[PDB]
Design a protein around this ligand. Structure first.
Ligand code: OGA
Ligand code: MG
Ligand code: NI
Ligand code: ZN
Length: 331
């Protein structure tokens, strides 16, 4: 078995190897990359996502989210308070302000220490989940707005023809902006490209051990657990590496820098934070190996997780028993 310790793997495809996206994903899995839940892909030196970022300040963040924390430094939840719209130019200036900027630090480890020590005492503002793309249309390789769709994968593998679309989303981050512990909708893959700015630190639990993280989360967030049988779908809970180590949960960590891709694999729980002002683009995708994960994915039916139009069809076809109850939650 390849990668039996479930380490995060880092790939350096050549420009030739970067032509066929599906083939490269299948290659990485042949080497065991999926066992980690997360992989890094460094693009060939010749590749570029677009020519410059020189004109991005005019993108609108219609609903910036202030991420307010509750709990203790290592075990907290966050709630998203909606703020007034602002442009990316306004948000970047805010991120660079004295109130919100990255503190002085020695290296990524010192910054990680400061994040876990101090996150809860601040409320950074995150521009999340903004439909759009920063890939140039002329970028033919690993262009996250040109991937094969999940609906087309389900049709090729299973013959079924469904409604729905699959488009990318932009994320504008600042110091301390945080992504809570989650897997993807329907336990899909994700791919995330850091277009510019400061790094993103990731934490990940191997898929084969995801239930260990779930059981700890039920112990640490016991009222949330009684409220919903899949409350990590709410994407609000944080647990620090120190707490994960104290409780024996297997995990890995890695820092993504500008110009790099990350892939998350089906049922790979992940969480993380931004080091400073940045912009990422991410989208869900599927392969044949996902189908079985989609069939087994948990679902939030309490009504809090409230997800896309396109997820309806996935539930309806892969999980017809759940359909009914999950749509009671979504209506
Ligand atoms: O970058 C972020 O804030 C969160 N992204 C993801 O969880 C992802 O790409 O799957
Ligand atoms: Mg612009
Ligand atoms: Ni994710
Ligand atoms: Zn729920």
């Amino acid at each position: 078995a390849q990668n039996p310790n479930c380490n995060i793997m880092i790939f350096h495809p050549t420009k030739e190897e970067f032509n066929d996206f599906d083939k490269y994903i299948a290659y990485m899995e042949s080497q065991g990359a999926h066992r980690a839940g997360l992989a890094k892909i460094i693009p060939p030196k010749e590749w570029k996502a677009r020519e410059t970022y020189d004109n991005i300040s005019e993108i609108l963040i219609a609903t910036p989210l202030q991420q307010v924390a509750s709990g203790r430094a290592g075990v907290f939840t966050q709630y998203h308070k909606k703020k007034k719209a602002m442009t990316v130019g306004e948000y970047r200036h805010l991120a660079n302000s004295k109130k919100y900027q990255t503190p002085p630090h020695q290296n990524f480890e010192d910054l990680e220490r400061k994040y876990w020590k101090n996150r809860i005492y601040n409320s950074p503002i995150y521009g999340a989940d903004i439909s759009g793309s920063l890939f140039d249309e002329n970028t033919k390789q690993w262009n996250l707005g040109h991937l094969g769709t999940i609906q087309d994968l389900l049709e090729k593998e299973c013959g079924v023809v469904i409604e729905g679309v699959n488009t990318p989303y932009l994320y504008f981050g600042m110091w301390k902006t945080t992504f809570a512990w989650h897997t993807e909708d329907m336990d899909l893959y994700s791919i995330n490209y850091l277009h510019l700015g400061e790094p993103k630190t990731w934490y990940v639990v191997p898929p084969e051990h995801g239930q260990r993280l779930e059981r700890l989360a039920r112990e640490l967030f016991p009222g949330s657990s009684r409220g919903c049988g899949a409350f990590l779908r709410h994407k609000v809970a944080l647990i620090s590496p120190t707490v994960l180590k104290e409780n024996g949960i297997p995990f890995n960590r890695i820092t993504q820098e500008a110009g790099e891709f990350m892939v998350t694999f089906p049922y790979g729980y992940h969480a993380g934070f931004n080091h400073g002002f940045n912009c990422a683009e991410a989208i869900n995708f599927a392969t044949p190996r996902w189908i079985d994960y989609g069939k087994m994915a948990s679902q939030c039916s309490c009504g809090e997780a409230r997800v896309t139009f396109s997820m309806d069809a996935f539930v309806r076809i892969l999980q017809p028993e759940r359909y009914d109850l999950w749509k009671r939650g979504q209506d």
